[PDB]
Amino acid sequence: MSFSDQNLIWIDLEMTGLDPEMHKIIEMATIVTDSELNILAEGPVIAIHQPESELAKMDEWCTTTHTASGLVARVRQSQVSEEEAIDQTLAFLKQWVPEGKSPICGNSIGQDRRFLYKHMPRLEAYFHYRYIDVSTIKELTRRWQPEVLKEFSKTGSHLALDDIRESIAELQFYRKAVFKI
Ligand code: NA
Numbered sequence: 396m397s398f399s400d401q402n403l404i405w406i407d408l409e410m411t412g413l414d415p416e417m418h419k420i421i422e423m424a425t426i427v428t429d430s431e432l433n434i435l436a437e438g439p440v441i442a443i444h445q446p447e448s449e450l451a452k453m454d455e456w457c458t459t460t461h462t463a464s465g466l467v468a469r470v471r472q473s474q475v476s477e478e479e480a481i482d483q484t485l486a487f488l489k490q491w492v493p494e495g496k497s498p499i500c501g502n503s504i505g506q507d508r509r510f511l512y513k514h515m516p517r518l519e520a521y522f523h524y525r526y527i528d529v530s531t532i533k534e535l536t537r538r539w540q541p542e543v544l545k546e547f548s549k550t551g552s553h554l555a556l557d558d559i560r561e562s563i564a565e566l567q568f569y570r571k572a573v574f575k576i
Contacts (some may be wrong), residue, residue: 396490397429397435397491398490398491398492398493399429399430399492400492400493400496401429401430401496402427402428402429402430402435402491402492402496402497403427403428403429403430403432403492403497403498403500403527404425404426404427404488404492404497404498404499404500404521404522405425405426405427405428405500405501405559405562405563406423406424406425406426406499406500406501406504406507406511406559407423407424407501407502407507407555407556407558407559407562408420408422408423408507408510408511408555409421409422409423409461409466409553409554409555410457410510411445411449411450411452411453411457412452412453412454412457413506415509415510415512415513415514416513417452418449418452418510419443419445419449419514420443420477420480420510420514420515421442421443421445421450421461421466421467421470422440422441422442422443422466422469422470422554422555423439423440423441423443423480423484423555424437424438424439424440424441424555424556424559425437425438425439425484425487425488425559426438426556426559426560426563427488427491427492428500428563432563432566432567432570434560434563435491436487436490436491437556438484438487438488439480439483439484439487440555440556441473441475441480441483441484442466442469442470442472442473442475443470443473443475443476443477443480444470444471444473444474444475444476445470450467450470450471460553461553464552464553464554466553466554477514477515480515481515481517481518484518485517485518485521488521494520494521495520495521495522495523496523497521497522497523498522498523498524498525498526498527499511499522499523499525499526499527500526500527500529500562501527501528501529501559501562502528502529502530502533502558502562502565503528503530504526504527504528505526505528508522508526529562529565529566529569532566532569532573533565533569535573536569536572536573539573540573543572543573546568546572547564547565547568547572549561549565
């Protein structure tokens with residue numbers, strides 16, 4: 396419909412920890428915006444099944460966070476593997492953005508990209524090599540005019556779709572508050 400090579404692919408992952416070689420993806424969500432950050436479509440929100448032995452690698456922060464959000468129960472119930480999650484996400488993205496054109500967009504998105512390289516390389520390959528990291532702008536704002544940051548707050552629920560929605564809202568806030576373009 397509004398298929399364009401200027402559209403942006405936003406992605407957030409939840410994981411069993413911080414180390415791609417050790418840990419696993421347990422949730423993925425994607426959103427497509429246009430170049431002006433208008434949300435065009437939300438993609439599959441997928442709790443990815445992992446066996447107990449992988450969930451058992453989670454530290455206290457991960458265990459309490461992902462249990463209290465209901466994600467662990469959804470992971471245990473899920474019948475969707477990483478490959479099926481890739482397939483579903485690619486089938487969605489191909490309707491909105493061409494392959495290789497959108498940077499990866501989100502908060503500290505380098506960490507997510509590391510997990511994509513290791514666990515979902517077919518999905519990583521869909522992104523342009525660049526990064527649109529909203530936390531880059533957060534950090535520069537904290538240093539150049541930190542009082543701006545008191546005007547925006549995040550819930551930070553670690554539900555992947557809600558957090559990527561917050562990432563977009565954060566960048567929308569920055570465009571009005573710290574940008575002049
Ligand atoms: Na994240």
